Structure 1
Amino acid sequence: SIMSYNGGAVMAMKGKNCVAIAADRRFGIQAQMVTTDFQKIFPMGDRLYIGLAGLATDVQTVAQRLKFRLNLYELKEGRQIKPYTLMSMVANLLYEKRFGPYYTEPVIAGLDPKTFKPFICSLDLIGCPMVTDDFVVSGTCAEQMYGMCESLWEPNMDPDHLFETISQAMLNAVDRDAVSGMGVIVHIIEKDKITTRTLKARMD
């Protein structure tokens, strides 16, 4: 699969008043790793991130393309962007290549700019949005992360149990996966501040 060319896994999880997004660090050509510091979670303003998984070309291309349109929007309008607006923008940008498609599965996780309301959604390679309340995942090891989050999630979660739940989910779902591993970066954000922790994952 073209989706299984470089691996990749992005998990986002909605907590009580906060949201946590995590991804893996590994980059390489299919059986050969290259580096452990490939960035897949990008900042789009304050208290709002996006995660990208799949082929790395479309990852960096869509990230830069989106940053282009995002800064043009935030300069035409002095306010910062609402998450539904970002979701629709990514959907329109992907659907402009309906028949020339990018190979990526964006995951958006961010808070409300007015309230402290969390937001998660994910898209497909043609622009199909999907808003949920618990979690969205994207990458090769989908079924593993589905099993983890449908196994471990509770509705009302303090950030500590949120962090440990997404930690255990990512560690176990990545360790069953082959082509995706080599470390975990975790972004746990809230109304007040933004916390970024990296886990002691198996480097095998």
Structure 2
Amino acid sequence: SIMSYNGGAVMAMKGKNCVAIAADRRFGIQAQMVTTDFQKIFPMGDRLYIGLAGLATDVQTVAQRLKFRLNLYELKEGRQIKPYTLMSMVANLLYEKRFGPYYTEPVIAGLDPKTFKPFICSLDLIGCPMVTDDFVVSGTCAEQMYGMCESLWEPNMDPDHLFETISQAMLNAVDRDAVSGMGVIVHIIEKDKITTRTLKARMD
């Protein structure tokens, strides 16, 4: 598949008042790893982040194009974008290319600007938006991640527990995928602070 060419794994989980997003760090042309520091999670609104997996070019282009639209929206509106609105904006961008799509499946993790309510969302290549109350996973190792998340996830997890659960699911799932791995980066989004941690992962 085109998606498997560059590889990539991204997932987001919801906690009591916190959200977490994690991604594999390997950039590979196919079976060869060019770099282990690739960015798949991009800051959008301070407490709002989007993780993109798929063709590395498309991941970079959509992040660059989305930021252009979001930066213009924030300046004209005068307000930080709501997490739901970012999902609508990204869906419009993806649908515009419905006949020839960008090969990226976006996952959005964010906290509402005023309420601080946790929000997690996933979108398909052509812009279908799915919003979930638990976890959203996109990437080459999606089936593996769904299996780990369904068993590990529990409701109203505290920020420390959310970090442990997202990490265990991501590490074990990337372990079972050849084209995903070479380290995982986890961001915990809380109203008071952002905690970014790089996990110890097998390099192979």
Question: Aligned partners of 1:189 and 1:82: how far apart in 2?
Answer: 15
Q: Report deviation, 1:115.
A: 1.1
Aligned-residue sequence identity (percent) comes to 100
SS of the residue corresponding to residue 5 of structure 2 reads: coil
Q: Report deviation, 1:52.
A: 0.2
Q: Report deviation, 1:30.
A: 0.9
Question: Aligned partners of 1:130 and 1:45: how far apart in 2?
Answer: 20
Question: Aligned partners of 1:19 and 1:141: how far apart in 2?
Answer: 21
Q: Report deviation, 1:156.
A: 1.0
Q: Report deviation, 1:116.
A: 1.7
The count of residues paired between Structure 1 and Structure 2 equals: 204
Question: Aligned partners of 1:189 and 1:167: how far apart in 2?
Answer: 14
Q: Report deviation, 1:19.
A: 0.4
Q: Which runs of 5+ in 1 are unaligned?
A: none
Residues 122-142 of structure 1 show CA distances to partners (whole Å, capped at 9, x for unaligned) of 000101000010000000111
Q: Report deviation, 1:189.
A: 1.1
SS of the residue corresponding to residue 4 of structure 2 reads: coil
- Normalising by structure 1, we get a TM-score of 0.99
Equivalent position of 1:151 in the other structure: 151
Question: Aligned partners of 1:133 and 1:58: how far apart in 2?
Answer: 27
Q: Report deviation, 1:15.
A: 0.9
Residues 149-179 of structure 1 show CA distances to partners (whole Å, capped at 9, x for unaligned) of 0010000101111111111111100101111
Q: Which runs of 5+ in 2 are unaligned?
A: none
Question: Aligned partners of 1:161 and 1:148: how far apart in 2?
Answer: 15
Question: Aligned partners of 2:136 and 2:106: how far apart in 1?
Answer: 10
Residues 55-85 of structure 1 show CA distances to partners (whole Å, capped at 9, x for unaligned) of 0111110110000001110110111110111
- RMSD (CA atoms): 0.6
Moved over 6 A (4+): none
Residues 82-114 of structure 1 show CA distances to partners (whole Å, capped at 9, x for unaligned) of 011111000101111110210000011100101
Q: Report deviation, 1:51.
A: 0.3
